[PDB]
């Protein structure tokens, strides 16, 4: 009951930054985790034998891929912890445990393929979930991994609590296809405009709640430019290996997934700062005042893409 997870200064004062990096020491990632459990929802919020045994199975079902990781996975919970952190008084005690495992588990047993290509190689979860094909099968590697004995970490909440709780953690996961995130902004933009959002209005609070989910997921663009650009080389290398199974497959990819056409990787980083990551963290700020630190730091990393184009980089 009494045992903190402390951090070390440079760490206890920089977490609560949306830069944040967690840094290269894998075995000091599941520590960062629950601390930020700890601060957000209680040291109550879960029986920490179970915490623990939870987290280190959600790691195992994580894949040795250069993007879509375990490291992945704790960089989306932080962000989500310093959005929590930021907005104090506008979520439930349920909302806060619940999105920090809903970041954790988002990517759980990802491969380093899209949607697409698993619907082109006509893979067994195209059959079973015909959209938002891996994030369903987030949502299932979730319940799976809750299941096993002793990692039932909701296991103290009340039978219509741990339904509204895995009720959050889906929608949030499913939310994390980028398909969707077009419409949600879409709407969300309209509803902010004609002043019609309304946060007690259930399906308000869901629409906002995935916006959460798109802007953790991209956080990877709002770090210090060092970061965010050493990160893209990650993602890359994912793009370039599904670009190589398209061709395989007797399918050109599209020119940003081609290991053959790098050169047009930073006017394809133009696009997605311009049509998903922008728009994405402006709505977010405006619903959101406190999380203008990713608009700003956003636009910070959109003028150094500008400035590797015009070869000053
Ligand atoms: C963090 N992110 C994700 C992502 C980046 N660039 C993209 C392009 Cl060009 C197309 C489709 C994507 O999902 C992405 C990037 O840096
Ligand atoms: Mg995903
Ligand atoms: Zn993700």
Known sequence: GLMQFTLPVRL???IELFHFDIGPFENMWPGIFVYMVH????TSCFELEKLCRFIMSVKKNYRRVPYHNWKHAVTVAHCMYAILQNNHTLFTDLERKGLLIACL???????????????????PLAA??????????????????????????????????YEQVLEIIRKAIIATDLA???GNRKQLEEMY??????????????????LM??????????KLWPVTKLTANDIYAEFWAEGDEMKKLGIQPIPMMDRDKKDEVPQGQLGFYNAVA????????????PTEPLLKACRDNLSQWEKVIRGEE
């Open 12 to 14: 206890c004062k920089e």
């Open 39 to 42: 601060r957000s929802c209680g």
């Open 105 to 123: 588990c988002h990517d759980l047993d990802h491969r380093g393929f899209s949607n697409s290509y698993l619907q082109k190689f006509d893979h």
């Open 128 to 161: 079973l979930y015909s959209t938002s094909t891996m994030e369903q099968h987030h949502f299932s590697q979730t319940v799976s991994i809750l299941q096993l004995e002793g990692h039932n970490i909701f296991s103290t909440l009340s039978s219509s609590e």
């Open 180 to 182: 969707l995130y077009f």
């Open 193 to 210: 405009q004609t002043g019609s959002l309304n946060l007690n209005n259930q399906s308000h609070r869901d629409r906002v709640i995935g």
């Open 213 to 222: 989910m798109t802007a953790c997921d991209l956080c990877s663009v709002t």
């Open 278 to 289: 922008i728009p994405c963290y402006t709505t977010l700020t405006q619903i959101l005042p």
